[PDB]
């Protein structure tokens, strides 16, 4: 089940359902995913091999992440230790005397005669029956916890593995691009790959551009920023690359007083 999730196809990305199935190669799915977080195709077409080298470094690094310092890998051991501690409690409670002369029924029969031996045996019976009731109550609570955590596991696979979540924090930190899941002891192990910026450039931006006509036609960027490099340019949100303003990245909006009133070197959308 898990190893089949890697080659699964669910849609074109820009589609709005699970009805269709598009056989887009894994390479072309990531670039469309990276174009959805605010990177233009010009950067992708120019940094094609750079992205793959970065991605392969990330995949090789998770080999060394299996250490107790990691939070996720610790939770794996905590689950195994939870299972182990369940069996330890059962074994320990047979070393409990509960006030009897011994924890062994053989010792009680060896050491005592009726009617005194029945009382000592009955002392172990009530204690062990009480211990099992406590064991059953704990097991039920663990079973419900695993049951409701399995529901989140189905949630994680559908939103992180089979698609690209737009939710911050969910499906890992940064900006989600692709998540891989593998079988783990008593659960699943995910690999939330994210887009982590490393360096920044501070650039002046504009809320929008308007022309001095009646009525003033105004535009706003689709998924990036208007940006200076006296001319205005479009850049992606997740990567800096000034590009001309066009219908591919400009969306018409109503007039606002915070937009730039342009008179020279107008973008093609604001012409005519």
């Amino acid at each position: 089940y898990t190893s089949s999730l890697l080659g699964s196809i669910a849609g074109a990305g820009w589609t709005a359902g699970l009805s269709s199935f598009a056989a887009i190669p894994f390479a072309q799915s990531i670039f469309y995913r990276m174009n959805g977080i605010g990177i233009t195709q010009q950067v992708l077409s120019e940094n094609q091999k750079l992205i793959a080298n970065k991605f392969n470094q990330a995949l090789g690094a998770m080999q060394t992440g299996f250490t107790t310092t990691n939070l996720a890998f610790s939770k794996v051991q905590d689950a195994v230790n939870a299972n182990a501690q369940a069996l330890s409690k059962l074994a320990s409670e047979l070393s409990n005397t509960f006030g009897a002369i011994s924890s062994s029924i053989s010792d009680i029969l060896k050491r005592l005669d009726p009617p005194e031996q029945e009382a000592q045996i009955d002392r172990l019976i009530n204690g062990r029956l009480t211990s099992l009731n406590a064991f059953v109550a704990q097991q039920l609570v663990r079973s419900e916890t695993a049951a409701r955590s399995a529901q989140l596991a189905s949630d994680k696979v559908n939103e992180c593995v089979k698609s690209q979540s737009k939710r911050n924090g969910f499906c890992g930190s940064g900006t989600h691009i692709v998540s891989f899941v593998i079988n783990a002891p008593n659960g699943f192990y995910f690999f939330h790959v994210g887009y982590v910026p490393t360096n920044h450039v501070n650039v002046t931006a504009a809320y929008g551009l308007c022309n001095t006509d009646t009525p003033p036609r105004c535009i706003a960027p689709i998924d990036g920023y208007f940006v200076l490099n006296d001319q205005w340019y479009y850049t992606g949100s997740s990567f800096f690359n000034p590009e001309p303003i066009t219908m591919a990245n400009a969306r018409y909006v109503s007039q606002d007083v915070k937009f730039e009133n342009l008179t020279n070197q107008l973008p093609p959308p604001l012409l005519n």
């Binding site: 991605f55 992440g65 996720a72 994680k156 890992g172 659960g187 995910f190 690999f191 790959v193 982590v196």
Partner: peptide, 8 residues
């Protein structure tokens, strides 16, 4: 690319 690991 930052791989965040999670166990469910």
């Amino acid at each position: 690319f930052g791989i965040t690991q999670e166990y469910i």
